[PDB]
A paper describes a structure:
NAMPT functions as a homo-dimeric enzyme that catalyzes the rate limiting step in the primary salvage pathway for NAD synthesis, the transfer of a phosphoribosyl residue from 5-phosphoribosyl-1-pyrophosphate (PRPP) to nicotinamide (NAM) to produce nicotinamide mononucleotide (NMN). Crystal structures of NAMPT in numerous ligand-bound forms have been reported. These structures consistently display a NAMPT homo-dimer with two essentially identical active sites at the dimer interface. Typical NAMPT inhibitors were found to occupy the portion of active site responsible for NAM binding and a tunnel-shaped cavity extending from the NAM binding site. Furthermore, we determine the crystal structures of six NAMPT mutants in the apo form and in complex with various inhibitors and present a definitive model to explain the differential effects of the mutations on various structural classes of NAMPT inhibitors.
A previously published in silico model predicted that H191R would protrude its side chain into the tunnel and sterically block inhibitors like APO866 from binding. When tested across a panel of structurally diverse inhibitors, H191R reduced potency across the compound families, but remained more sensitive to APO866 and GMX1778 than series A inhibitors. The R191 side chain indeed occupied part of the volume inside the tunnel region, but did not completely block the tunnel passage, thus imposing a more stringent limit on the size of linker moieties in the inhibitor molecules. The bi-aryl sulfone group of series A compounds exceeded the available space, whereas the more flexible and narrower linker of APO866 can fit through the altered tunnel.
Author numbering:
A (entry chain A): 8 to 43, 53 to 487
B (entry chain B): 8 to 42, 53 to 486
Write the structure that this text describes.
Amino acid sequence: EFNILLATDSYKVTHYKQYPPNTSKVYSYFECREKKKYEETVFYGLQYILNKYLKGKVVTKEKIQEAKDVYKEHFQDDVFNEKGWNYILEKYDGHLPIEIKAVPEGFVIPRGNVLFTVENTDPECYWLTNWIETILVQSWYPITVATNSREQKKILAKYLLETSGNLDGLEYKLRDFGYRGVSSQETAGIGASAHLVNFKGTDTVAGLALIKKYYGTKDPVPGYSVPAAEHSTITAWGKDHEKDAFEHIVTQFSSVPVSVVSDSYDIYNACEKIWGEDLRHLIVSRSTQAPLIIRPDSGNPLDTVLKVLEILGKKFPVTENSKGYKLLPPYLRVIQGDGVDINTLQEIVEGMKQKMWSIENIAFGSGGGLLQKLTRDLLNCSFKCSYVVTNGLGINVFKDPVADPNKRSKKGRLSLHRTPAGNFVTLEEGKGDLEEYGQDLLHTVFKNGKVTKSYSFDEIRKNAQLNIELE
Amino acid sequence: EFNILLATDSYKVTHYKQYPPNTSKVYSYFECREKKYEETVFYGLQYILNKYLKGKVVTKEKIQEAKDVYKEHFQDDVFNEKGWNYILEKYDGHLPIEIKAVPEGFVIPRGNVLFTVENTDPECYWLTNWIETILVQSWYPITVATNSREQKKILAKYLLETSGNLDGLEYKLRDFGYRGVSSQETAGIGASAHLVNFKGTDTVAGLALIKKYYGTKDPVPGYSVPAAEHSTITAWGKDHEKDAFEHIVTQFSSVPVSVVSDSYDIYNACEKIWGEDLRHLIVSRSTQAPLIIRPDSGNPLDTVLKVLEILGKKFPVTENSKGYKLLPPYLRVIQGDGVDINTLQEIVEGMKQKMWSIENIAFGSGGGLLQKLTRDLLNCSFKCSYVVTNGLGINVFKDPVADPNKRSKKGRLSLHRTPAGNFVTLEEGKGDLEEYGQDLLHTVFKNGKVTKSYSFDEIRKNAQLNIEL
Ligand SMILES: O=C(/C=C/c1cccnc1)NCCCCC1CCN(C(=O)c2ccccc2)CC1
Ligand SMILES: O=C(/C=C/c1cccnc1)NCCCCC1CCN(C(=O)c2ccccc2)CC1
């Protein structure tokens, strides 16, 4: 079972002996720190951490003893605040005397603003605020996945509007293929759920149960898939029988959309000769509600997409839409699911535009690029102490390293406000108390072991909409 | 609770319908496919087998749950209820799968078979690749353990050159990655993988994983020491950094203590606060209880070099038997910012050029060690190589025209020692010809049971550097 006493960086076990004597309050905050592009971030994922790990009776006698035994060996010394943990057990029935205030989930906030704050509610527990730094900072991951996914949605929206004149099907155009390419089952669920803030297409099944348990949707499920081959289901037929595999699969899934990986041996042969000649009769007969989606999976991603489109354009009837861009017949589409990240997505859609192909033609799948190839320094997600009370006097505290101004932190008690022009500002030094800027946008979401405010997944999605969608 | 019926890529739910009719066997394998990182450490499959795959993993409730989810997720009924029910009824929900694998901790060149998977019941031909997704997650502990070992090789080379021995090597790269990984589960897995090569960690999650799944003769596989963070210095107020330092080193007067020194001005902290104001509290410390000064910002090489130059003028420096400068035994440095395999190399080489022994320094690495890694670094990949259809075995493979690097292996596979003592993978069942001795793979899972396993002590032994051996 999970033990919050064993869920911190080891060194934090020793910090209760390091703060100034007579310290009754430690107050800390989280930001995606500005760096001298990702100019705005989607705040998502804290509610998962609050419910799974921080709420309710999280301290027991057994958990205290267990931690004491492990730390004895791990440090080869007796440092461990057994008394401090016993106090929370006896006084609060093991509930954390902590208050957390946060911006609503789904909110889209510029870099360098306070996103949440943490402080102890009992003077004895001044050490507890930063004990939970480690677990709370892991919110960097769903924030960053949700943010990077939204930035990809912006690119897709721009090019789809330009080449087609609308945004139809935008939420279905970037699929999560990342389940195998993340570091753990838990990561898979968190990451998949963060992608679903922006899109509806996923093969990372783990995201669904996470959303149902911790957030919830009006709809039965937040994400959807369609039948699709993998190389095993083609190659099992034997090298000389690729056409047999294709024919069998499209006939098995004749009335729903079906994706067929087409590059096992020669993607260009498969498109021109197998799909384009031998099996053409099984393709042109398909419903608009049940297209074949041809899937290349190797080679230079842009060069391969353009060549596949070129081949299919010469084998199938192409129209020109009202913006002047070429469109495949409605029973045929393409999905590129190899080597797609934010950079290559941009290259591909711009390449398509230059060659006059509508973005209606194509969907994208992304795996490692979407869920694994991200770190905490992409958005500089960071947790810092900004205010303490010592001997009953508050002091505004901060770091400001001489050789790196980008690592300077904020001072004092913080609040988040709308500006007169409708943007965001973080007020420092308790200046929100002067009430010159309307209401603080941070709300209490956790207090003394209870989750005090929750958001549904539908609300989060609404908060995270693109401006272009709003327009 | 975990449900293996809901722990695969969505599209695999539809694959049972796509294989050739009358297929009784699907046989697949995992490799770190060949195209830096010429050899890989095999680690982490034992965790997956025990946590997720062994015993009764199918129940009536789990089947109904998956049926209900997939009905909405596909907007159609495509889920193989009958196939899963067969497993429940016939095998009391134990997976009729056999997995063979190289021993954990083994160091194997790229492009070799590391494990294989096949069904043991013809009805369950579709099951082999259902579990691809979970098994392929082994890329992560493999990659962490591998990249961590590559860093140990660098540290070994430079420590040996500047000091003449390897004393303390295993304590020189510390895992600081707990906050920087994507989940609690990842933290434990990744920390355990670093502990294959090193003994220093602040990612507490790794300890419990190892104890549960691998085991060590020692009470714990990894260790930490007291250390400050910016909040324990800055809480004292900007004019009282010296007061913070004095309090901390006095509280931890008889054990090693690390104290982050860059809150305001690292160079002032080293030269004036440690080097003058509090110098008397440093030179009095035991060899068993050094102060470790921790810079945490600026260019990593430049900052380390300047910190060492400052301390070298404030404290008595010696010259070791190799001609390199050495701080007194009560004083060391740790660089825990910006460290990855590339910057590690730059820092130790830069120290060597300035005649500073690698004894003087330890490193901590967080996102670089545990997060900034992907499955394409070692090209970890699972593919089908052999099937039986209508009673006839067929060697199968992919070989995409535009990427010969993606070509997969054909047929039944085995791993062998060559006459020169290296590894070779034989394809097409050629291992059966017996020209290359016994298969080095071992059966590790069969029909719901883990059949062979390794302690963490054995894994560490297998993963040793040549220089250590
Ligand atoms: O290729 C794979 C998965 C590969 C995979 C998975 C996991 C790991 N590694 C690889 N999945 C196929 C998904 C693409 C389906 C498209 C999306 C857009 N689209 C519609 O929105 C639609 C239009 C008209 C009618 C109905 C729907 C047409 C159907
Ligand atoms: O700075 C932090 C943690 C920072 C942190 C943690 C988590 C997240 N973010 C930042 N930890 C201090 C590590 C100090 C390691 C050295 C290794 C070599 N060494 C001995 O081998 C030794 C010498 C004499 C006696 C006993 C042992 C001296 C101690």
